[PDB]
Paper text:
The eukaryotic guided entry of tail-anchored proteins (GET) pathway mediates the biogenesis of tail-anchored (TA) membrane proteins at the endoplasmic reticulum. In the cytosol, the Get3 chaperone captures the TA protein substrate and delivers it to the Get1/Get2 membrane protein complex (GET insertase), which then inserts the substrate via a membrane-embedded hydrophilic groove. Within the membrane targeting stages of the GET pathway, the homodimeric ATPase Get3 (also called TRC40 in metazoans) adopts closed and open conformations in response to nucleotide load and interactions with other pathway components, allowing binding and release of the TA protein respectively. However, the cryo-EM structures and native mass spectrometry of hsGet1/Get2 and scGet1/Get2 show they form a 2:2 heterotetramer, which is stabilised by Get3 and interfacial lipid binding and is important for efficient TA protein insertion.
To understand the molecular function of helix α3’ in detail, we now investigated the effect of a polyglycine substitution of helix α3’ (Δα3’)24 on the structure of the human GET insertase. As previously for the sequence with native helix α3’ (referred to henceforth as ‘wild type’), a heterodimeric fusion with the flexible N-terminus of Get2 truncated (hsGet2ΔN/Δα3’-Get1) was purified and complexed with apo hsGet3. The complex was subsequently reconstituted in PMAL-C8 amphipol and a single-particle cryo-EM reconstruction was refined to 4.2 Å resolution. Interestingly, the membrane-embedded region in the Δα3’ structure shows pronounced differences compared to the wild type complex, with density for only seven of the twelve TMDs in the hsGet1/Get2 heterotetramer. Rigid body docking of the hsGet1/Get2 model into this density revealed that only one hsGet1/Get2Δα3’ heterodimer half is resolved and adopts an identical TMD arrangement. Notably, the structure reveals that the Δα3’ variant causes a complete repositioning of the resolved hsGet1/Get2Δα3’ heterodimer within the complex. Superimposition of hsGet3 between the wild type and Δα3’ complexes highlights a twist in their respective interactions with the hsGet1-CD, with the coiled-coils being rotated and tilted by ~15o between structures. A model for the missing hsGet1/Get2Δα3’ TMDs based on superimposition with the resolved hsGet1 coiled-coil suggests that the membrane heterotetramer has a converse orientation to the wild type GET insertase: the hydrophilic groove is rotated into the heterotetramer interface, whilst hsGet2 TMD1/TMD2 are moved to the periphery of the complex. Instead, the N-terminus of hsGet2Δα3’ TMD3 abuts hsGet1 TMD2 of the opposite heterodimer, burying a surface area of 190 Å2. Interestingly, the hsGet1/Get2Δα3’ reconstruction contains an unassigned rod of density in the central membrane cavity, which points into the hydrophilic groove of the resolved heterodimer then extends diagonally towards the luminal side of the membrane.
Numbering used by the authors:
A (entry chain B): 23 to 108, 140 to 190, 220 to 344
B (entry chain A): 23 to 108, 140 to 192, 216 to 344
C (entry chain C): 1028 to 1124
D (entry chain D): 189 to 234, 254 to 291, 1005 to 1124, 1149 to 1172
Write the structure that this text describes.
Amino acid sequence: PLEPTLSNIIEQRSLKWIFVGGKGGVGKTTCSCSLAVQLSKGRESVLIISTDPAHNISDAFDQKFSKVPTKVKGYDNLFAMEIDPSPGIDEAMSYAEVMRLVKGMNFSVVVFDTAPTGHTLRLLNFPTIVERGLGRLSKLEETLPVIRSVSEQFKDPEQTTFICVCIAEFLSLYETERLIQELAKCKIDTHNIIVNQLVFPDPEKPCKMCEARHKIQAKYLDQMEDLYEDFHIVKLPLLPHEVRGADKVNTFSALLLEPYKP
Amino acid sequence: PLEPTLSNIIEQRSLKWIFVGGKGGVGKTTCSCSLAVQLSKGRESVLIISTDPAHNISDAFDQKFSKVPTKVKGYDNLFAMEIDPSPGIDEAMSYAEVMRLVKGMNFSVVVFDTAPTGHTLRLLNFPTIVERGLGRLMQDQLASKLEETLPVIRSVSEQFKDPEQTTFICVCIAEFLSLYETERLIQELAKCKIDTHNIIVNQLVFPDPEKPCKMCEARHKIQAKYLDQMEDLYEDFHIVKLPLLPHEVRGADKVNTFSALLLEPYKP
Amino acid sequence: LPSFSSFMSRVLQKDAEQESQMRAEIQDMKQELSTVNMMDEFARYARLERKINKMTDKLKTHVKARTAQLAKIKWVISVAFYVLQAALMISLIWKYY
Amino acid sequence: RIFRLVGCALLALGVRAFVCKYLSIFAPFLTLQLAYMGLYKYFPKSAEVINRSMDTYSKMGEVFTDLCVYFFTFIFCHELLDYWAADHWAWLLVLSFVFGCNVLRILLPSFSSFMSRVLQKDAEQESQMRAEIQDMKQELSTVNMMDEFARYARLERKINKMTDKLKTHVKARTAQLAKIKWVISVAFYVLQAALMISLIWKYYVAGGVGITCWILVCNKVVAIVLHP
Ligand SMILES: [Zn+2]
């Protein structure tokens, strides 16, 4: 059945690329920064990269950033960055410049935060196809290796991995199913489905809606287990609206090592 | 501003097809049941249909049904129906069969409960295509069957594109993904030129300070924001909110309470 | 053309049996699916779509490859046709000489 | 592959140099010995019925080229001697003939480009249409969802609308010009067939097949070399 701890993802060196995904009202920025803060301890230096146009990393970390990767206040190895720049050639060259500047820093683990619609690495595969046709008939050559390199980097099931993130609602469940199949189709690897916004009530609260939803969500969570015994599961209870900020991030990330006990 | 009640539907006398749709965990079957129980009162006779595989009508009524209309105890006009089989010629034949039987026996209004995966109105486009083909191809029992379908199919088609006798009720929940879904759905419907005036919402919590519970206000604010941006973006279409019900009563009683709340404007 | 089509079909009967039985069961379980609740059985339901996808895509790509070799047999019969024009050509050649 | 071809080109040059000298009665035998040289050379460098068929077509094409090339070698060592009647003009004229026929089969793209007389008035409109749709989507990109779905959907429906308008316009134009080019193509096509039947009646068996050889076995190769 496995264990509800991300021990595998922490206890591995060969990983260099971690991708977090998932639609719905999910705190993708929160769990991204969470995994990053925990991963940093064991690792040497971690470079967070956003793609969501909401830039919630700024919100959660209370500092301003830009296209330059910079340090992070109140920390030592933490490194942040974000690029909204994430016919068909100038996008590929911008992305090539991005990945070059990445390899220059050569950070051990570059964790991403994909945006609301899909995955950014499905897109990258398009330029090569058209590029080969164009060759059939300069900069494109130089560009080629810096790309085939990361293409192997990604196709490797040992150096990169996916972590989808879901809520306990049937729509999101079916969507995440479709996502997992699309991934396994496109030959990536994956081992992790974080769940999120988990209520945990107790008899001290006589609220009845809190028990109606409780049973519903419970039942769903168990049907969830049945269909994913292969993959790991990460229970992650919903936090009060009380604490928001570094306080939250620290506390929340603490959960990703020991199982939650209410 | 625009009335939060379903007065137009309840009051209109030319309605013949009232579709109900909308993906998610919503109890669309229950909502349609309530709409039917209310519509029957003023009107003469209402015939429900169903297409969902869960046959929720069964658990909601404690009665068995089949492929034939049937009266339900405690009601003199509500008749239940369900169709689990619901080539192309024989598909049209089965659909024409249901249409003729549903419509012939003096039925003023027909209510649908579409399934949560796909859409069957657009189907009619396939027939009319074939019709053009049939004349163009020329220029036994199958020819007679085709003759008995195309006029009927084309006749039943105009009541649907007609914005005064066909009406769609989408239903969504106050959450992003479902909101976006019912958005794309409204847009695709308006593209296919089908009338629509009503967006029921569902599973609405309504807390009070008597409950020191914190999640009941966290979700509350969430629901507020979403419901209000929704109003802003759908001020035209009527919005008729429905409160969440506790789990104590399930059955006719919840049906008649939802019915009352849909008739009269809700206020806690 | 008709004769050759008859022969190809009569050899390809193995394909015409297997593809038939497969799609047949495919719809059998698709209907089964249609009789499966989307709230209390989603797990098994998901196993069923995954099965359908694997079966379909694999045999389908197999079909692409089969039709590829089939169009290669149309190109060898087109070579045969070009040999029949060379034939009638030498026929008029001898009609003269 | 190209090197063996230029090798048979130097073979052709040697054939022009000495075959007409007619040192001995050996023309066809030397033809087929030079052909054996390359035929054998192929092997060092290099189901069952399928393998044969692919080769047969390749060899037939090449031999047909080489064999008539040997005939051209009698047409040039003696053209200079002419300078040292009506027949040599009759050979020269079919050069012009086939230059014209193939510059028109390459002129067909010129008609494609000539469609731009009306495609300019089409392009101005369609291009402005694009300009608006692209800037609208670029501004859309800078919009969030959770707190701005209203504006999101507003722009989405606006774009999608103008978008479908544009697709329809472009499809109509393309699906119109396409038939235009099809018909003008069949038109000049039957006009070159008319020119062929015209020359055929102008020269109204060996001569006809020879003409076909000069107009195809050589010209098509020249075309695949200069404008592949
Ligand atoms: Zn509560």
